[PDB]
Design a protein around this ligand. Structure first.
Ligand SMILES: CCCCCCCCCCCCCCCCCC(=O)OC[C@H](COP(=O)([O-])OCC(O)COP(=O)([O-])OC[C@@H](COC(=O)CCCCCCCCCCCCCCCCC)OC(=O)CCCCCCCCCCCCCCCCC)OC(=O)CCCCCCCCCCCCCCCCC
Ligand SMILES: CCCCCCCCCCCCCCCCCC(=O)OC[C@H](COP(=O)([O-])OCC[N+](C)(C)C)OC(=O)CCCCCCCCCCCCCCCCC
Lengths: 231, 161, 85, 78, 78, 78, 59, 59, 59, 78, 59, 78
């Protein structure tokens, strides 16, 4: 089975071509922490710790073109599928993990064995290592699940509230001309307030979820970075 | 050419109880009430002492845990094992309570509540309130309000008993 | 139900169907055509890359002896849990 | 005898149960802001920084409530 | 045998459960104000910035209570 | 087979559940007044502004209680 | 069960009241009045739940 | 179950009573009276739940 | 389930007792008496819960 | 007599019950960030170090919710 | 389920015990004995719940 | 008359109830780390030892969560 379809970005692609045929500075970034990993001077890393910048920027651009514009009615999030997001996060996370593993430095994993020598190795430390190895994959799964569920719930709520607002506005506006106009006015004001609040909340939450999505990957990378000191 | 430190000439040091030690049942609190480098009471065995710190009132009895209290303008009470109460009034300072059974209350000023006059205190409150009305700026108002708080505390302290 | 239906792609244009057997056979024909010429010796890494993994997978499939039944991959109906056929 | 029964109305019950998860989330969010007020009064110079961390915590806590709410919609719409 | 059953009154049960989600929301709101009083009492000059944050926390907590309330009314009318 | 059943005692069960949410409200009230007293002791000069804010917190918390109570009464008489 | 929170809420008020009184004994009267106020407000909710219970009991 | 929110509330009052007593112990005779007052109110709430537990248990 | 509140409330009383005793050990005797009083009240509620259990289990 | 019954809408109930576990996870997260906000105001110089530990708790606290969320799917889709 | 309110209460006691031992590290013995007393009383409540659980389980 | 009934769908309810036990584990972990942040600010010189103890506490709580999941999986399958 082969389905031919298109993304909902063609107009946005046209705008990108129109407005970026000439150079422009970028000073505001959703996830700025991918550029500044080291905060104490004289610390440097031999690992390609800045490899994630391009992917981070592209992912931010793609997800922002989709999610932020989805607040517009009838706009479609073409990628909104659980297993597709799983594939994306699998790609990124497993690629970085295999980059760390292909280094063939087993000592890098010494920190997995949690605790000190005082703790019993078999009954405490080994179980903790098992839990942490499991927790890495759980972090990947949680990242993708969170990204999916946030959008799904937000848009479900928006659709339901918009349906209710349409119903009351269309089939109960005549109350303005009736003696119970005050009740309708109060309800309409509440609906407007809820509309504004929901839109603001969704706008903020989309950006915040993208920030968290990139921060999980950056945390994965940072967990295995070692910094040398200049002398 | 090494010089002595000014604390070498002081022969009454503070005794701290090692944490890994047995407890003792104490029926007396050794109080040291001090004003402007002058002790009004010295290692006096008392039954209890009541002090008003910023958070609230503390009733210190023998064996009280180690604590440092920042006093506020307020009365201070000392009750002896005999059953005698002595009331002072303090304008500020600190109170150091030691788990060994000692309490060193160092105040900038500590005056017996008898010395204070309610008539003088009352009319001063009226004058300062008028001064607050004429206070030029925010800083001046804050200073005036400091005086009123002390005065009202004094007035309320004397009206209590 | 209706709110759930709003989360579908909105620009579906065409759907094409093809049997696994047919396109697998066509791919095998193409692979044979490109790996047949004499100037690609059988010991070349390219030829082994082309053939060995497929041979290994097919051998593993043939050797399989499972006590359970695996329903046909391309049935007409695979939504009934109580009818593997 | 083998009897198979399919009760339709049960999906309402499961939906209501998931809503209970919001009780913890709503309470959890209020806890964060309560600490925020009690922290800004202890170090007002950082109020802007604290407000930022409070918001981050709100989303993480809020994100969980959405998970439960998704299940409610799934069962309420199926 | 295949038996299909449709129980009517279950929607009342599910609606009541969603109402319980307002227990944490009401408690959470009360917690915010309780913390607000302490912060004001320990830093009386910040009687407005703290008040604004308390309102913001209430709005978010109210939002969670409203998400649940939508299900409570929706199931009651399903 | 298609069977429709109408139980006439399940409008009681939903009502009882909606009343449970009141506990989350009633407890919330005590928390606001539990901390109001402490704030008054800490800063007796603000016995008035704190009291007004506490009333605001109690009213908002009670607002949640009445939203739940509305569902409780609707299902009791329907 | 709605009374569980109401009864607990009262305990919270009469718990902090002691701490407030011990800290500032001079304001017992004002604190006591506010404690009574809070108790009345909580009791109102308790009666609301009690009203529902009795109605569903004798109906 | 309502008793759980009552008995716990009682413990909360006494727990704060100890701290209040251990802060300024000369007010114990006053705090204890207020502590009893709180127990007299929360216990009263428990009676209402107990009343229903008995009415439904004998009807 | 009512025992959950009773058991927790009892633990709450003793938790405050340790803090109070550490603060002012000289009053351990008076605090201990009050702590027992609180337990004697919380456990009393537990008796009602047990009584109901034994009044319905054996019925 | 031997009677076998299969009630086909019960998986909704189990899914909702598992979803209830998310209330504790949300509450724990709010507690973590509440302690973070009230701890940074005490030792601001170490703000960053505290934030790292706060996230660690979230990583070790959100994971538990996944298990409960996992069970919901294993019963909701079966 | 009653055990949930028992285990938590026990944790509350020991949690306060550590703080008390921190505040007053020379009074560990009296705190430890009182903590054991609270545990015994709370555990007794749990045993009562266990009694009912086994009575119904074997009935 | 003697009637024996075997309901196939009751294991979902048991699985959901067991999953609720995680709400305490999640909240317990949140409490552990909330105090950890407070303790570190109080005495930052002992960050490592406190972190070690916090991990130990998390492990024990996680162990309880594993026991609850074991019961949930057993009932879900068996
Ligand atoms: C049988 C029926 C026919 C169909 C047969 C199909 C056979 C299938 C075989 C089996 C395949 C199995 C696997 C399939 C998997 C599919 C998966 C999928 O769909 O995923 C979604 C996914 C959606 O991606 P997306 O995010 O939407 O972005 C992709 C877009 O293409 C946009 O991405 P982009 O913008 O980044 O792309 C770069 C873009 C950069 O931007 C541009 O260049 C702008 C233009 C964009 C064009 C592409 C968009 C198309 C929009 C819709 C169609 C436009 C109108 C067509 C009108 C048709 C009228 C009938 O540049 C181009 O696209 C380069 C091409 C430009 C062509 C310009 C031609 C100019 C001619 C001028 C002639 C002048 C003559 C003058 C003579 C004068 C004489 C006097 O699809 C893909 O990623 C691509 C899937 C393709 C898979 C391969 C299929 C095989 C090739 C088939 C070719 C058929 C040609 C013959 C057709 C004849 C008419 C009927
Ligand atoms: C960084 C933050 C950005 C914040 C942006 C804030 C924008 C504020 C907009 C105010 C209201 C605008 C009303 C427009 C009305 C249009 C006509 C109409 O009928 O609309 C109805 C529609 C829907 O209204 P409706 O729901 O009442 O429709 C009723 C119709 N029936 C009955 C048939 C169902 O209006 C909207 O959807 C408006 C929502 C806007 C939400 C904000 C979107 C921001 C993200 C997109 C930004 C795009 C920028 C691109 C720039 C270039 C990039 C390279």
């Amino acid at each position: 089975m082969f389905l031919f379809f298109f993304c909902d970005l063609f107009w946005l692609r046209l705008l990108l071509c129109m407005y970026y045929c000439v150079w422009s500075r970028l000073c505001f970034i959703v996830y700025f922490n991918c550029l500044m990993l080291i905060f104490d001077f004289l610390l440097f890393c031999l690992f390609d710790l800045y490899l994630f910048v391009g992917l981070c920027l592209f992912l931010l651009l793609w997800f922002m073109l989709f999610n932020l514009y989805s607040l517009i009615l009838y706009y479609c999030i073409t990628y909104l599928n659980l297993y597709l997001l799983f594939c994306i996060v699998f790609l990124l996370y497993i690629a970085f993990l295999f980059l760390f593993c292909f280094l063939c430095d087993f000592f890098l994993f010494n920190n997995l064995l949690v605790g000190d020598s005082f703790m019993d190795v078999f009954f405490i430390r080994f179980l903790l290592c098992f839990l942490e190895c499991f927790s890495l994959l759980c972090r990947c799964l949680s990242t993708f699940l969170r990204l999916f569920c946030n959008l799904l719930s937000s848009h479900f709520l928006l659709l339901m509230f918009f349906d209710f607002f349409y119903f009351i506005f269309v089939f109960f506006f005549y109350g303005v001309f009736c003696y119970w106009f005050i009740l309708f006015i109060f309800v309409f004001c509440f609906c407007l307030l809820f509309y504004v609040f929901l839109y603001l909340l969704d706008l903020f939450a989309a950006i915040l979820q993208l920030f968290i999505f990139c921060n999980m990957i950056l945390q994965l990378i940072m967990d295995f970075l070692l910094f040398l000191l200049f002398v | 050419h090494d010089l002595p430190e000014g604390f070498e000439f002081m022969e009454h040091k503070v005794v701290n109880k090692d944490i890994h030690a047995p407890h003792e049942n104490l029926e007396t609190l050794r109080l040291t009430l001090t004003r402007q480098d002058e002790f009004l009471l010295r290692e006096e065995p008392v039954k209890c002492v009541t002090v008003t710190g910023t958070n609230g009132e503390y009733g210190i009895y023998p064996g009280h845990a180690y604590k440092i209290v920042q006093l506020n303008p307020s009365p201070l009470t000392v009750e002896y094992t005999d059953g005698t109460t002595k009331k002072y009034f303090v304008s500020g300072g600190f109170a150091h309570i030691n788990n060994e059974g000692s309490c060193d209350v160092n105040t900038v000023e500590c005056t017996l509540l008898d010395d204070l006059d309610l008539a003088i205190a009352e009319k001063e409150l009226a004058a300062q309130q008028a001064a607050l009305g004429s206070a030029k700026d925010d800083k001046a108002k804050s200073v005036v309000e400091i005086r009123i708080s002390v005065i009202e505390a004094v007035i309320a302290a004397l009206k209590h008993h | 139900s209706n709110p759930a239906d709003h989360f579908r792609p909105n620009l579906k244009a065409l759907t094409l169907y093809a049997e696994r057997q047919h396109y697998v056979d066509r791919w095998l024909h193409v692979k044979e055509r490109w790996l047949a010429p004499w100037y690609l010796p059988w010991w070349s890494p390219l030829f082994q890359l082309g053939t060995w993994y497929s041979q290994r997978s097919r051998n593993l499939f043939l050797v399989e002896n499972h006590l359970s039944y695996r329903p046909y991959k391309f049935r007409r109906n695979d939504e009934d849990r109580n009818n593997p056929y | 005898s083998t009897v198979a029964i399919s009760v339709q109305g049960l999906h309402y019950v499961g939906t209501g149960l998931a809503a209970i998860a919001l009780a913890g989330v709503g309470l959890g969010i209020g806890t964060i802001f309560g600490n925020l007020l009690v922290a800004c009064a202890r170090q007002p110079n950082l109020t802007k920084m604290l407000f930022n961390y409070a918001i981050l915590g709100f989303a993480l806590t809020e994100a969980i409530g959405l998970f439960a709410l998704m299940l409610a919609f799934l069962m309420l719409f199926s």
